[PDB]
Design a protein around this motif. Sequence first.
Motif, short mmCIF file in Angstrom:
data_model
loop_
_atom_site.label_atom_id
_atom_site.label_comp_id
_atom_site.label_asym_id
_atom_site.label_seq_id
_atom_site.Cartn_x
_atom_site.Cartn_y
_atom_site.Cartn_z
N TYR A 230 0.79 -1.23 0.00
CA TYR A 230 0.00 0.00 0.00
C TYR A 230 0.83 1.29 0.00
O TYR A 230 0.40 2.30 -0.56
N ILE A 238 -0.92 9.37 -4.77
CA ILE A 238 -0.84 10.71 -4.16
C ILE A 238 0.07 11.63 -4.98
O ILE A 238 -0.26 12.79 -5.22
N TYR A 273 -15.19 5.53 10.32
CA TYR A 273 -14.40 6.60 10.91
C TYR A 273 -12.95 6.57 10.48
O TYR A 273 -12.37 5.51 10.29
N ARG A 274 -12.39 7.76 10.33
CA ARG A 274 -10.99 7.92 10.02
C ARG A 274 -10.41 9.07 10.84
O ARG A 274 -10.94 10.18 10.81
N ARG A 275 -9.32 8.80 11.55
CA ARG A 275 -8.56 9.87 12.20
C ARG A 275 -7.59 10.40 11.15
O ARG A 275 -6.64 9.72 10.77
N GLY A 277 -4.83 12.93 9.40
CA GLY A 277 -3.70 13.81 9.66
C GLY A 277 -3.86 15.15 8.96
O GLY A 277 -4.68 15.27 8.04
N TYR A 312 -9.71 11.66 -2.36
CA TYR A 312 -8.43 11.03 -2.13
C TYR A 312 -8.02 10.30 -3.40
O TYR A 312 -8.79 9.51 -3.92
N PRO A 313 -6.80 10.57 -3.91
CA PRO A 313 -6.28 9.79 -5.04
C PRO A 313 -5.89 8.36 -4.62
O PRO A 313 -5.99 7.40 -5.41
N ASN A 314 -5.46 8.23 -3.37
CA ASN A 314 -5.07 6.96 -2.79
C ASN A 314 -6.28 6.13 -2.33
O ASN A 314 -7.35 6.68 -2.09
N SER A 317 -8.20 3.92 3.99
CA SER A 317 -8.59 3.08 5.12
C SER A 317 -9.42 3.85 6.14
O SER A 317 -9.16 5.02 6.42
N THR A 318 -10.43 3.17 6.65
CA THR A 318 -11.34 3.71 7.64
C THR A 318 -11.60 2.61 8.66
O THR A 318 -11.15 1.48 8.48
N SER A 319 -12.33 2.94 9.72
CA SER A 319 -12.65 1.97 10.75
C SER A 319 -14.14 1.93 11.00
O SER A 319 -14.81 2.95 10.85
N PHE A 328 -2.99 7.48 16.73
CA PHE A 328 -3.64 8.67 16.15
C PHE A 328 -3.86 9.79 17.17
O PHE A 328 -4.61 10.74 16.91
N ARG A 331 -3.79 13.41 16.02
CA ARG A 331 -4.67 13.78 14.90
C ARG A 331 -5.91 14.49 15.43
O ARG A 331 -6.54 14.04 16.39
N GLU A 359 -11.11 -2.66 10.08
CA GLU A 359 -10.77 -1.83 8.95
C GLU A 359 -11.59 -2.09 7.69
O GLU A 359 -11.68 -3.23 7.22
N1 LIG Z 1 -6.31 6.78 9.88
C1 LIG Z 1 -7.30 6.00 10.36
O1 LIG Z 1 -8.22 6.42 11.06
C2 LIG Z 1 -7.17 4.51 10.08
C3 LIG Z 1 -8.29 3.70 10.23
C4 LIG Z 1 -8.19 2.32 10.00
C5 LIG Z 1 -6.97 1.76 9.63
N2 LIG Z 1 -5.83 2.58 9.47
C6 LIG Z 1 -4.53 1.96 9.09
O2 LIG Z 1 -3.61 2.26 10.18
C7 LIG Z 1 -2.26 2.29 9.66
C8 LIG Z 1 -1.56 3.61 10.06
O3 LIG Z 1 -2.46 4.74 9.99
P1 LIG Z 1 -2.19 6.02 9.00
O4 LIG Z 1 -3.47 6.75 8.82
O5 LIG Z 1 -0.98 6.74 9.46
O6 LIG Z 1 -1.80 5.29 7.60
P2 LIG Z 1 -2.13 5.93 6.17
O7 LIG Z 1 -1.35 5.20 5.15
O8 LIG Z 1 -3.60 6.02 6.03
O9 LIG Z 1 -1.52 7.44 6.31
C9 LIG Z 1 -0.12 7.75 6.01
C10 LIG Z 1 0.19 9.30 6.06
O10 LIG Z 1 -0.13 10.04 4.81
C11 LIG Z 1 -1.43 10.44 4.93
N3 LIG Z 1 -2.27 10.57 3.90
C12 LIG Z 1 -3.26 9.73 3.57
N4 LIG Z 1 -3.89 10.20 2.50
C13 LIG Z 1 -3.30 11.33 2.14
C14 LIG Z 1 -3.53 12.24 1.10
N5 LIG Z 1 -4.52 12.02 0.23
N6 LIG Z 1 -2.75 13.33 1.00
C15 LIG Z 1 -1.77 13.54 1.87
N7 LIG Z 1 -1.52 12.69 2.87
C16 LIG Z 1 -2.27 11.58 3.03
C17 LIG Z 1 -1.87 10.48 6.41
O11 LIG Z 1 -2.32 11.77 6.81
C18 LIG Z 1 -0.60 10.05 7.15
O12 LIG Z 1 0.15 11.20 7.58
C19 LIG Z 1 -2.38 2.17 8.13
O13 LIG Z 1 -2.16 0.81 7.74
C20 LIG Z 1 -3.84 2.56 7.87
O14 LIG Z 1 -4.31 1.95 6.68
C21 LIG Z 1 -5.94 3.96 9.71
#
Ligand SMILES: NC(=O)c1ccc[n+]([C@@H]2O[C@H](COP(=O)([O-])OP(=O)(O)OC[C@H]3O[C@@H](n4cnc5c(N)ncnc54)[C@H](O)[C@@H]3O)[C@@H](O)[C@H]2O)c1
Length: 392
Positions: A230, A238, A273-275, A277, A312-314, A317-319, A328, A331, A359
Amino acid sequence: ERKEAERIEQKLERSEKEALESYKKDSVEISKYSQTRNYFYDYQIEANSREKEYKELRNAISKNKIDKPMYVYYFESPEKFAFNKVIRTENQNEISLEKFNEFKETIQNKLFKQDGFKDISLYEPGKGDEKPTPLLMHLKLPRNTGMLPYTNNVSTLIEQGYSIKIDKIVRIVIDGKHYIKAEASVVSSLDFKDDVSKGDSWGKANYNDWSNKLTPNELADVNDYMRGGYTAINNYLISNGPVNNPNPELDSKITNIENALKREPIPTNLTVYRRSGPQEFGLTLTSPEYDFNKLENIDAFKSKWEGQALSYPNFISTSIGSVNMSAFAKRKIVLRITIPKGSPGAYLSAIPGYAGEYEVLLNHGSKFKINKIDSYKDGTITKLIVDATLIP
Ligand SMILES: NC(=O)c1ccc[n+]([C@@H]2O[C@H](COP(=O)([O-])OP(=O)(O)OC[C@H]3O[C@@H](n4cnc5c(N)ncnc54)[C@H](O)[C@@H]3O)[C@@H](O)[C@H]2O)c1
């Protein structure tokens, strides 16, 4: 009315009667708690002095369910529906046609998540009733909604936990003053909030054999992604890789993961839900605008994002759970997404040897309409809840 309340009281346990007594003394802080309790850490929730109170009061309401749909009345703040302005002042009598239509434009084609305890009435408020705002809600609650009449005069408690849509607004007059009456409906959605265990059972029930619906190439690529692929996949997306530095191998994996997410579509309206950044919203950890303790930064955030689209281009992940996680802790933006039935997605945590918990993965290039943004205090840190709908 009062007679119903005295009958319904007999159905209550002593602990539930006890919860109701506290509610009468502390309605405001308990209602406030009931709205945001599920966003904190599990240990903060269990420790909260109003948590047993919440559970008991929640239980009491569930013991008087309505046998048919019912309309309820209550006043609401327009800021609840992302109208961050006065419709009219308390001194003023009229609501202009321009302000009416501006409110209409704002609430149009949106679903609004509503939460927490709320005192309602079965009768339209009149000349001698408490009328706190210029916005009166006339909401149809579906059959089987809990409803607790109680004596304090007499009031009725419900627990909101659903999206509402505003079907119609009308300018009415009560006691020589204009109000906006909003005809609203409930759109139901599966929302597990802090009940991650029940969310897991649902997830596993619905995605236990998801692997077996996948071709071997789809399965290998989803596996590759969950095994750590991933990072490369999503950074490529991205960074605008398909346009500026194409990688056909990655494009092929992306396509397969997308097809896998469309294979067993989300079977019901689901809240996730998503926390988030700071970089998801064009900020950094050291951005002064990221300081939501300052009110002008919340206004600037809402001005940019509320009512607008986020994509989001990527892959995202959510919960299924809303609880905070130490990973988190720093965040400040909680993204609360409604996923329409039939949307792409998969509960990845249903896969046997997968480390991820609770997830749901969403498709790359997903778009969300932000309906409404709320702020809340997490200790000393102000945080934001972004009420969004996936538009697939
Ligand atoms: N964030 C959540 O609430 C959440 C929920 C369920 C599972 N997870 C999983 O937990 C693990 C760690 O969490 P995470 O959120 O740091 O991983 P992540 O890969 O989702 O995030 C990586 C980093 O880049 C980011 N990012 C994501 N999309 C972006 C975008 N479009 N533009 C710029 N930055 C972007 C995030 O803000 C973070 O700083 C991962 O495996 C993720 O899939 C996260």
